[PDB]
Amino acid sequence: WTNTSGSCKGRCFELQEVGPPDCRCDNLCKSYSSCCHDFDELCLKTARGWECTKDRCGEVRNEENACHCSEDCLSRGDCCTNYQVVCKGESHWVDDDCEEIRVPECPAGFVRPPLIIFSVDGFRASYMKKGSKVMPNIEKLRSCGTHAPYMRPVYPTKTFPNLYTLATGLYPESHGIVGNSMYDPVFDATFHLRGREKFNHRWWGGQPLWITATKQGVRAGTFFWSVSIPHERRILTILQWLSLPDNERPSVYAFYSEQPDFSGHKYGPFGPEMTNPLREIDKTVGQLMDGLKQLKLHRCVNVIFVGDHGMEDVTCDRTEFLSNYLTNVDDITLVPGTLGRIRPKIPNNLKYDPKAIIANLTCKKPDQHFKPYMKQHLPKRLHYANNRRIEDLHLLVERRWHVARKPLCFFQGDHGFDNKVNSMQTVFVGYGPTFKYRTKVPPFENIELYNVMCDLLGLKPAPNNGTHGSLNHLLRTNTFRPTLPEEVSRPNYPGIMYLQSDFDLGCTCDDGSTEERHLLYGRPAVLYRTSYDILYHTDFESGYSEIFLMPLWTSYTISKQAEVSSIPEHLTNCVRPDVRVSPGFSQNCLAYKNDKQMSYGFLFPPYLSSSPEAKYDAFLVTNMVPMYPAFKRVWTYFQRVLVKKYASERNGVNVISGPIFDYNYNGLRDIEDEIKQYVEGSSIPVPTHYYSIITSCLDFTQPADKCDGPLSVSSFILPHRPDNDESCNSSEDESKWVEELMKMHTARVRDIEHLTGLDFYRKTSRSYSEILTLKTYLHTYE
Ligand SMILES: *[C@@H]1O[C@H](CO)[C@@H](O[C@@H]2O[C@H](CO)[C@@H](O[C@@H]3O[C@H](CO[C@H]4O[C@H](CO)[C@@H](O)[C@H](O[C@H]5O[C@H](CO)[C@@H](O)[C@H](O)[C@@H]5O[C@H]5O[C@H](CO)[C@@H](O)[C@H](O)[C@@H]5O)[C@@H]4O)[C@@H](O)[C@H](O)[C@@H]3O)[C@H](O)[C@H]2NC(C)=O)[C@H](O)[C@H]1NC(C)=O
Ligand SMILES: CC/C=C\C/C=C\C/C=C/CCCCCCCC(=O)OC[C@@H](O)COP(=O)(O)O
Ligand SMILES: *[C@@H]1O[C@H](CO)[C@@H](O[C@@H]2O[C@H](CO)[C@@H](O)[C@H](O)[C@H]2NC(C)=O)[C@H](O)[C@H]1NC(C)=O
Ligand SMILES: *[C@@H]1O[C@H](CO)[C@@H](O[C@@H]2O[C@H](CO)[C@@H](O)[C@H](O)[C@H]2NC(C)=O)[C@H](O)[C@H]1NC(C)=O
Ligand SMILES: [Ca+2]
Ligand SMILES: [K+]
Ligand code: NA
Ligand SMILES: [Zn+2]
Numbered sequence: 132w133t134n135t136s137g138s139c140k141g142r143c144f145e146l147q148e149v150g151p152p153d154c155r156c157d158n159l160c161k162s163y164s165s166c167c168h169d170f171d172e173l174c175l176k177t178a179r180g181w182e183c184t185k186d187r188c189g190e191v192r193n194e195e196n197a198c199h200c201s202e203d204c205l206s207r208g209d210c211c212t213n214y215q216v217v218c219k220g221e222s223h224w225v226d227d228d229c230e231e232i233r234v235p236e237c238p239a240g241f242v243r244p245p246l247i248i249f250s251v252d253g254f255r256a257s258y259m260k261k262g263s264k265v266m267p268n269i270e271k272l273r274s275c276g277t278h279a280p281y282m283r284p285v286y287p288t289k290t291f292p293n294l295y296t297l298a299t300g301l302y303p304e305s306h307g308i309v310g311n312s313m314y315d316p317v318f319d320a321t322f323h324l325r326g327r328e329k330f331n332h333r334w335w336g337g338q339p340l341w342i343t344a345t346k347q348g349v350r351a352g353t354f355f356w357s358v359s360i361p362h363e364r365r366i367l368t369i370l371q372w373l374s375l376p377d378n379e380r381p382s383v384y385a386f387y388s389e390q391p392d393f394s395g396h397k398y399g400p401f402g403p404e405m406t407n408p409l410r411e412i413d414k415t416v417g418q419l420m421d422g423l424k425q426l427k428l429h430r431c432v433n434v435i436f437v438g439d440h441g442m443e444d445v446t447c448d449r450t451e452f453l454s455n456y457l458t459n460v461d462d463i464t465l466v467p468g469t470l471g472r473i474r475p476k477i478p479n480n481l482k483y484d485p486k487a488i489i490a491n492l493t494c495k496k497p498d499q500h501f502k503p504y505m506k507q508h509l510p511k512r513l514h515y516a517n518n519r520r521i522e523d524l525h526l527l528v529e530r531r532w533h534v535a536r537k538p539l540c541f542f543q544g545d546h547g548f549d550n551k552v553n554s555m556q557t558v559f560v561g562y563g564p565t566f567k568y569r570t571k572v573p574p575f576e577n578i579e580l581y582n583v584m585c586d587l588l589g590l591k592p593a594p595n596n597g598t599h600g601s602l603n604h605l606l607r608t609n610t611f612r613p614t615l616p617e618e619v620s621r622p623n624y625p626g627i628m629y630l631q632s633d634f635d636l637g638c639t640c641d642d643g644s645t646e647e648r649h650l651l652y653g654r655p656a657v658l659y660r661t662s663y664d665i666l667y668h669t670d671f672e673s674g675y676s677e678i679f680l681m682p683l684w685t686s687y688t689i690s691k692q693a694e695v696s697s698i699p700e701h702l703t704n705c706v707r708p709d710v711r712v713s714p715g716f717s718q719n720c721l722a723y724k725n726d727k728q729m730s731y732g733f734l735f736p737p738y739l740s741s742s743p744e745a746k747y748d749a750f751l752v753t754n755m756v757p758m759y760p761a762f763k764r765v766w767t768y769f770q771r772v773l774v775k776k777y778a779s780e781r782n783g784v785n786v787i788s789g790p791i792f793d794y795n796y797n798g799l800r801d802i803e804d805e806i807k808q809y810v811e812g813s814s815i816p817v818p819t820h821y822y823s824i825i826t827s828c829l830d831f832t833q834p835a836d837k838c839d840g841p842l843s844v845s846s847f848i849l850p851h852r853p854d855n856d857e858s859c860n861s862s863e864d865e866s867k868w869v870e871e872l873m874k875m876h877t878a879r880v881r882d883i884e885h886l887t888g889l890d891f892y893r894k895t896s897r898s899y900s901e902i903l904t905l906k907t908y909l910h911t912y913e
């Protein structure tokens with residue numbers, strides 16, 4: 132019980148936490164039914180609006196006014212933000228020339244630059260192109276500070292998952308807010324945007340920035356604002372807190388605006404109607420910046436202007452209905468819209484038939500505007516599977532479309548789609564002493580920001596999914612010095628030890644300076660305890676695992692001019708024992724011969740051997756990996772057509788390929804116990820995915836093998852599946868569908884590192900920070 136009888140006299144938006152029985156005067160109160168009886172009256176004044184007019188200057192203070200223009204307002208910290216411009220002849224901040232801020236210029240008593248996070252909902256990256264004509268304050272922040280052309284949100288590209296990702300540095304599958312709506316089968320409870328259940332702390336994982344700050348003795352303003360509190364009041368409140376005594380004043384602040392999202396939904400992202408809400412947000416940024424200038428803080432504070440996701444054109448007319456595919460949709464619950472998650476309407480309903488459902492949803496219309504996935508099959512770059520609140524059955528929906536359960540307008544915009552979709556990209560600008568001046572940075576992912584916000588506040592981040600140091604290039608100071616992970620397992624370098632006669636595998640073949648040409652960036656370090664051998668070859672090098680019986684990685688270089696050659700018919704089924712590696716640590720062809728479903732492929736492609744002699748090396752048993760015929764369609768096209776195409780296009784490429792095991796879909800390297808499938812009758816483990824990392828010189832005029840400067844990388848994590856049901860056009864020639872599949876499964880090098888326990892690019896001429904940026908890069912193909 133809370134005693135509402137008390138008063139918010141001299142308590143408005145107090146920062147001190149107040150529990151029952153006493154009543155509150157903070158943001159969470161209206162929201163919690165714990166406000167004092169005079170909260171609305173004392174704390175939410177509106178009288179006379181938000182701006183000083185000439186006729187108010189010098190006024191005697193009336194405590195009923197929303198803000199003040201009286202002579203004492205400044206030391207009281209409650210002037211309207213435009214007070215000085217109107218009453219003291221000062222200029223608006225936006226009208227002042229841009230000037231580099233080389234060090235914080237802070238008033239007496241400020242020990243470090245405060246951080247203000249100004250978050251905007253549904254701010255599409257491309258809105259920035261409207262420029263100073265529509266958004267002059269934001270344009271000044273953008274042009275004079277540090278900006279990315281866009282920032283990538285997490286999937287699903289909706290508000291709750293993204294704002295909490297900004298706050299924690301975690302993927303939704305790890306922080307737990309996997310949607311705006313979710314069902315937790317263990318709680319047997321439902322979380323909704325609307326309603327009180329979301330207030331229960333059990334839903335919220337990881338450690339958000341405000342808790343991290345507080346635990347390290349750094350004070351935070353509110354990161355929650357009640358919907359009933361107008362934006363102008365939010366800004367005045369922040370400015371009031373910044374005027375507090377040294378021993379009360381917070382170091383970190385957040386502002387949130389539900390615009391331009393609301394208007395985007397109503398009018399669509401390209402509507403002329405979007406101009407007004409954008410002007411309104413800019414006006415709010417102006418109030419903040421004018422207010423800061425009034426406090427002599429405009430060259431002291433670091434300001435982050437950041438969005439949660441973008442906005443796409445989505446209308447009533449573009450809705451797929453599940454009732455068109457399934458006979459009884461009244462028996463399922465669908466989280467609908469720009470994504471789909473399906474579960475039985477009755478929890479744990481035994482008649483739920485997910486295999487039959489997926490079958491009826493797979494490639495059933497030519498123009499089908501979604502694709503069903505079991506969550507383990509979703510592209511790994513989405514990191515969207517390892518949480519009990521994520522339904523097994525997912526629908527990835529095509530941009531511009533909705534999926535709904537059945538047919539049983541007022542919106543023209545929506546978002547939630549695959550986070551590499553252009554329309555979903557959002558904004559990032561950093562301005563202040565700690566950010567660089569007039570600097571553009573490449574796009575980056577929102578998971579990276581928590582680390583940077585900790586850097587800006589002198590905090591040590593809780594464990595998270597950012598790669599700390601990968602954004603050092605945004606900062607003038609406060610950068611994080613990363614340290615190389617130490618290698619855990621040193622390799623063996625086995626020389627010859629066996630004779631062909633020593634081998635009984637069922638295999639038949641009916642007929643320096645390797646490290647220099649083929650390992651351009653050093654050997655990958657193995658960051659777990661295991662046993663493996665380096666193997667050298669004219670055309671390739673590998674780290675062969677004696678445990679998993681195949682390479683952990685195979686590395687090779689292909690020159691721009693490289694020749695593509697066939698596999699001679701007499702070598703079609705050629706597999707050769709490797710006299711460097713014991714028969715007991717080798718695969719055997721017998722298992723393949725006997726397994727009616729599983730075939731094999733090679734990591735280094737015989738198609739790219741330098742000579743007919745060299746080709747024989749590609750047929751070694753130590754280059755062989757288990758591949759379903761379905762996967763082989765993809766892999767052969769990749770080995771035979773695409774790698775060469777890349778070399779020709781990029782002036783040579785260096786390729787590192789290998790297996791990934793992630794049977795429990797947690798995005799991390801499986802241990803032996805977690806592997807669940809082997810080649811028939813054998814102990815040869817079956818990868819869930821195969822990766823390839825393709826590196827070249829960013830300066831394409833230089834060959835990959837003689838690159839003096841920054842690198843260019845594209846990588847993939849291809850799902851190893853027994854069919855190509857994912858690819859609706861796979862009945863056609865590989866040239867009509869394989870690249871499309873690969874693009875969907877693009878990946879960061881960092882993603883591969885998590886999944887493999889390997890550490891790449893340890894011997895380069897670049898800084899460690901640059902390499903970390905490279906490893907976080909995602910080639911999106913948009
Ligand atoms: C992205 O970055 C994160 C953070 O580093 C990595 O996630 C971590 O993975 C490790 C290794 O697998 C896990 O270690 C295990 O820890 C558990 C005990 O964990 C409990 O206590 C910790 C510390 O207080 C807490 O963070 C954990 O929180 C999980 O569980 C909460 C309660 O149910 C839940 O509210 C929260 O959202 C989180 O759930 C997520 O993780 C669990 C696995 O723990 C998973 O089942 C769930 O679906 C969510 O994904 C928890 O209370 C020990 O018993 C083990 O021995 C082991 O040491 C970390 O717990 C885990 N941390 C978090 C916060 O998720 C990701 O691997 C990384 N991803 C990638 C791809 O790199
Ligand atoms: C570093 C932190 C980044 C920003 C600070 C702001 C919040 C940090 C908070 C994380 C928890 C946030 C919980 C949500 C508060 C806003 C709820 C909201 O107002 O939803 C608006 C609604 O349109 C979203 O629906 P939609 O995704 O647009 O379909
Ligand atoms: C709820 O709050 C009201 C207001 O503070 C409390 O009223 C006071 O109670 C004390 C204790 O007997 C009296 O001495 C005061 O005269 C009251 N003050 C006013 C201004 O009303 C009330 O006691 C609270 N209810 C509780 C404590 O259960
Ligand atoms: C999958 O789709 C088929 C139709 O293509 C559904 O089968 C129909 O539904 C009922 C019950 O099975 C039959 O009486 C109809 O004759 C079938 N229609 C056709 C056109 O053959 C099947 O029910 C669907 N499965 C699911 C799980 O929804
Ligand atoms: Ca795993
Ligand atoms: K076979
Ligand atoms: Na198919
Ligand atoms: Zn949003």
Ligand SMILES: [Zn+2]
Nearest residue numbers: 253392396546
């Ligand atoms: Zn929205």
